[PDB]
Symmetry: C4
Subunit: 389 residues, 4 copies
Amino acid sequence: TYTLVWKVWILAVTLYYAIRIPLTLVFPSLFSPLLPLDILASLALIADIPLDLRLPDLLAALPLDLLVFALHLPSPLSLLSLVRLLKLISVQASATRIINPALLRLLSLVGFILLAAHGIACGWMSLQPPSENPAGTRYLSAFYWTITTLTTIGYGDITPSTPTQTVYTIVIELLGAAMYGLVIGNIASLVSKLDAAKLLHRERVERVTAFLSYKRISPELQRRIIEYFDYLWETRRGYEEREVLKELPHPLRLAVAMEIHGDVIEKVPLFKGAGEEFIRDIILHLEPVIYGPGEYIIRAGEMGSDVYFINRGSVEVLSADEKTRYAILSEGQFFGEMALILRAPRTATVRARAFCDLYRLDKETFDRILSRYPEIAAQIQELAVRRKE
Amino acid sequence: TYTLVWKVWILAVTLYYAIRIPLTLVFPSLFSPLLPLDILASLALIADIPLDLRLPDLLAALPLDLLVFALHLPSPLSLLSLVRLLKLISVQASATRIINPALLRLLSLVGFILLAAHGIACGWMSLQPPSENPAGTRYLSAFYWTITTLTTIGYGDITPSTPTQTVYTIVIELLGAAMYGLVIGNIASLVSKLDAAKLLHRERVERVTAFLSYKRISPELQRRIIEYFDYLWETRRGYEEREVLKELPHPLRLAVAMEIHGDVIEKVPLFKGAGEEFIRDIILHLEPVIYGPGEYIIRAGEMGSDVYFINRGSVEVLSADEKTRYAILSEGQFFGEMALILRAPRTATVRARAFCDLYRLDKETFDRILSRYPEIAAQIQELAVRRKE
Amino acid sequence: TYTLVWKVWILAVTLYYAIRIPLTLVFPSLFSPLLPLDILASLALIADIPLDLRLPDLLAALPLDLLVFALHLPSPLSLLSLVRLLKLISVQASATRIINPALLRLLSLVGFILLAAHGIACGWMSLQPPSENPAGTRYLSAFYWTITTLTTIGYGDITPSTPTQTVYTIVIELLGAAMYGLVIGNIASLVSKLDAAKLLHRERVERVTAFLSYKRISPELQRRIIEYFDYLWETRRGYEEREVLKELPHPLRLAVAMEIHGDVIEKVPLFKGAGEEFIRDIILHLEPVIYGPGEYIIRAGEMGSDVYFINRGSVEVLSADEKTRYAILSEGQFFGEMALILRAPRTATVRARAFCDLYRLDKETFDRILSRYPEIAAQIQELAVRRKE
Amino acid sequence: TYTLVWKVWILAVTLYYAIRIPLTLVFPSLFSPLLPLDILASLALIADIPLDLRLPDLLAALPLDLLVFALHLPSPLSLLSLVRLLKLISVQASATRIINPALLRLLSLVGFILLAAHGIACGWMSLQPPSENPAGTRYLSAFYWTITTLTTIGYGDITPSTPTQTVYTIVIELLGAAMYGLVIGNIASLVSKLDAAKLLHRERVERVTAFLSYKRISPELQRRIIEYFDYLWETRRGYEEREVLKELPHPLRLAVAMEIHGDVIEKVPLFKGAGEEFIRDIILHLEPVIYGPGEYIIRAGEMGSDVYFINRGSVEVLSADEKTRYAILSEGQFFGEMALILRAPRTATVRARAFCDLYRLDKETFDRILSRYPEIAAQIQELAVRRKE
Ligand SMILES: Nc1ncnc2c1ncn2[C@@H]1O[C@@H]2COP(=O)(O)O[C@H]2[C@H]1O
Ligand SMILES: Nc1ncnc2c1ncn2[C@@H]1O[C@@H]2COP(=O)(O)O[C@H]2[C@H]1O
Ligand SMILES: Nc1ncnc2c1ncn2[C@@H]1O[C@@H]2COP(=O)(O)O[C@H]2[C@H]1O
Ligand SMILES: Nc1ncnc2c1ncn2[C@@H]1O[C@@H]2COP(=O)(O)O[C@H]2[C@H]1O
């Protein structure tokens, strides 16, 4: 690729102007060594209108720079040489078309502060009287004053002394010390905006835990829920698969679900090779669910028939009481299907042996796909009639 | 119109007082040239009670001004000449009856700051001792002090030196440096309140995109959803037509829907000339929906019959497989209607060729309008029986 | 009543202590004239335990004050004479049991600031060296310093000069300049918390108005919705009668609805004298609804029968077209009832003549009360069969 | 237990380093007495990798400390002796695995401020010139400067005077005066996050009370709702048993409900000894409900049959009118069950005598458990047929 390099070179050039132009405006001793670099940048400035596949980018290309510096034009006209800074408000969104978007918006709001402070400090040095000082010390004092004023510290060791400096200080205090607070608050808001899934899950578990304690609850149950919440966060990161997909259209939701539940399909024997249209029919009706250890799922005698497709874990299916346990199931298997095949209530208790994660499909869709597909119905029928001993 | 000019002249006059009255209170050298202007303004002040088609506007008309300045009355009585400023809290809502309301509330909260700062600076100059200084410099120093104090910079180069100045400074610090923060925070809140549709759509797409990546998703699908979101924002601006109309009453919602869906009616042949009562019956049951390119809509054999009225785009209707594609449809046409006419499942696959935007009406309302209207039912019946080849 | 006076006297006494005790701690010249007042207050302090129909009120009664001041006890023991300030954190909720609760919480958060600032200023004067200054000037300077430090202005004209003053300044900066910001933010939040109904209705109408304009809408309809919203705010203040009553229990909701809809009952002839149990049955099923001028309600031929009990306004019932309009209805009347009496569709169009406010009861409850009550059913039957001409 | 002591010793050691290391870096006169303590701490630092039942804890164990201080290595290499502070960002979550989580997060955000301020003050003393001053005064001045700068007071009595001190001050102002605001705002947010149930109930009752007054409501009803809200808060603390349990899985919700409703089971005669499976069936279908004094529940003649299991309070069952009241019921009893036993409407009015709290089970589940269990059905049948006189 080459857009990723071109839009980085453009950023490095529009920052080069943003740093160099005011420093040349205050120090006329420059522009002698830095002319080839400036023209090499400007030819790239005019080399972007053809590569457009709005108006601020048009203003930036015209070279008012190279003219004011060459003709030592008077200060009021020359101050308008800042038109090349208009690419800054046209690139921060053009360079956004490329990591976390929130992270790019924290780095962008810093560079803006460090450029505005440099501009204000450079403007402040221009209004001071002519003194025989090194450029480094004179710039350091101006930057120190600008950081003191913007942060609203106000040491007062150096202060304006002339009416024009007083007016400049008033303007900077009025509309520079308030915008800094806005940018700092935005930086705080979008550094808090990071990893919001953790900040949501933590708030949820705190809200649950507060109530589980006003009503005093046995520690053997109080610690059993924290384990489940830790497991849910540790296997799912607090994300929920329903509210995220609520806004996507049904074909796009179908395409996403074809990717997320890519593990349970083609794992159980009767999903791989079952076709394409059946899996497309059923992929939107399976819910994740998590069952803890020693935690019953089927109680051997109630109504209803929900089938549990095991994704990971193991169950310990038993009769009414223990009495020589029937068998054990593992990953890539399912149970609880013959309650609807034989139109009979549950015949055996099922309890998990570890933190099982498994997918449940309701009775309604199951009977629909029994009445809709013959091979699947025949397979479940023969498996149910065979598993009777 | 003339209200739009009168309520601007009134604003320009009530700002004229807000600027002139304290400056005349501190400098008695005025009131000599500015008497005809003040009486010309005051006659407009008393020319608004008849044009009332509450109490602060009544206080403002009485001319306490013109009296205190003429009679050089002592300072305690004269300070109460500020009653003409009471029109400010009666006009900012009267001038609101006229652009973005949020924008008018950002401009209003600025002028308030620039008027309060001027008032505080003017009050500060009055308490200083009698010195032979130009009025401009003495006002500039006072305004510099006021901006320093309100912004909470606190340079300290000029400070109160008398007990009365100390009390004034204490009052300004207590109830002027905190209100400024409130107004600045309000300005920030209602400049963030602007273009909230973009700030909602961006948050929604960021929330979706965060989860589509913890579960690693193929780039060919990861980039396919961003395209759909960009198209939705680019054709709809993130607005949703359901929550906005949830609060409007049913006749007003009907009237609005008569305007929003003004393109699909009188475009398809059987909506123009179909009457008024039928269109009024159906206009609230069509949903927008967006289908991407190469994205199937009908899969040729499932149950149900939802009719898709094409608004813009084109479909590529096919049989079970390709095998000499049937035909092609374009704007101002509809399909998927003969599944309910013949009480038969779908007979042909339909897939979009571009980013199609089209309106879907459910089976229930369709069968209702078939059983309710004879001409429409006959037209759909003959069209369905004709389109069989 | 006498609680309203006693709990005001108690406030005036616990503020008397909060102002007097530190001022006596720093100036020992007091306690000579102000002894009878202090004992008169203290006897009321001990006169509240019997009037208890928790522990801070017990600490406050014991008179550590009257002892430290009398015995000129050394400074470390005497500083613990501030136990009488513990009534402040026991009264602000006891005096709350009495206007807007939010307003009482804005006044309370001010007095707290003005008491904390006074305490900090009084503490600061005690640490300064012995100088021959008037008490007023010495207190004014201390209060000026405290307001400068708390507000984070930091003029720096007067600063700590000794290690103990440095430690005191560090403590005040650390835990006094941050709490002030918290209290100011709370004051802002609960002055914004006032009149929240207007702030909700304004936000709702702004949200609606933003979308009605991206889709360009005729001015004759764009101004017709603003009129309806203005009328709704002007007759209802933006309150909704459903979400407010969602949390009240059904008997309390019934009792409230017996009061809110006190105008439509005993206005229409067949509600007054209809009993008590019938009105109690129907009072929870009538909804307010607002219809604009020239805005149809019934379209003469559709299905369904909803009865509209007119509360205020007038309707202009017509046939299919105008053709010598049938009649006119006014307040305390109802229409649209014979559609269910004769099991026939609507026979006449109804349109409002002004901004009508009226109550609608659905068909289900209507047929229920027809099948449940004979006199009401007979009255509606004879009225419907009579109104046919 | 011993983890609770070990993870406190580790905290006390990692704070010992955080306080001692910079103070030794600036004052080389130390490290002579404090060597055995440092090695005793370091042996515990290396005694935690075996007790791991990530990478910052590995960096901390290696003893760069003990080396730089012993070898008086030059300042640039020695500044990297701060690696032992990396345990701070590994313990604040390890010590979290142990009171209110929000409270632990307010104490943690304080200690962080007091450690950062100490570090910045210690760094500031190192850059000052060599002066004959006591260590205490030199540290006090540095801490005073750091608190002044971080809080953004800016007294200006002591300011940087060298370019390196200017650069240090610029860095501290830029990234130390903004982080302090973030931490203070977080402290405010999570001290407001405390006791959120009260802050929710107060907001709810304020929202209800605002509307009950625009529509003027009789004081005898206006004060009757405040009593109910006070009773609900005073017996329930504003918590709701439905939204809290919405996220728990059905077995965990069942286990929690087995604990919360531990008072009504085994209180009424026919719940204790009724088994285990019946109580497990019914425990999720009983709702709390609160009825006020003199507040009717059953009106003797309507349809439906909801049974009210009395938990606390007493009812005053009456006939159509008073006429020698039937009887009185108390705790551990139920009524309103023979409306479904005999398929007849209600026969007697019921009204509470005090603030009754009782559990209601709907008709559907009741008839289900009648048709599902014979002993319970027989008991209710014989009790209903016996209670007829
Ligand atoms: N002998 C067995 N071996 C394996 N699984 C069984 C056996 N008996 C019952 N099951 C499963 O346990 C389930 C219990 O409930 P169902 O009757 O719905 O369906 C049952 C089968 O899925
Ligand atoms: N030959 C054809 N030409 C145009 N459209 C067709 C043709 N055959 C089928 N269709 C449309 O394709 C749709 C596919 O599903 P339906 O059977 O519901 O209704 C069908 C018609 O609307
Ligand atoms: N002549 C009339 N005078 C007054 N009201 C009428 C007259 N005719 C019809 N209405 C009312 O207008 C209503 C129109 O719809 P309905 O038929 O539901 O019930 C009708 C009556 O309530
Ligand atoms: N004599 C009585 N003693 C106690 N309780 C009664 C008596 N008569 C009726 N009840 C109860 O009051 C209830 C009123 O409504 P039900 O008829 O639903 O069921 C009734 C019984 O639970």
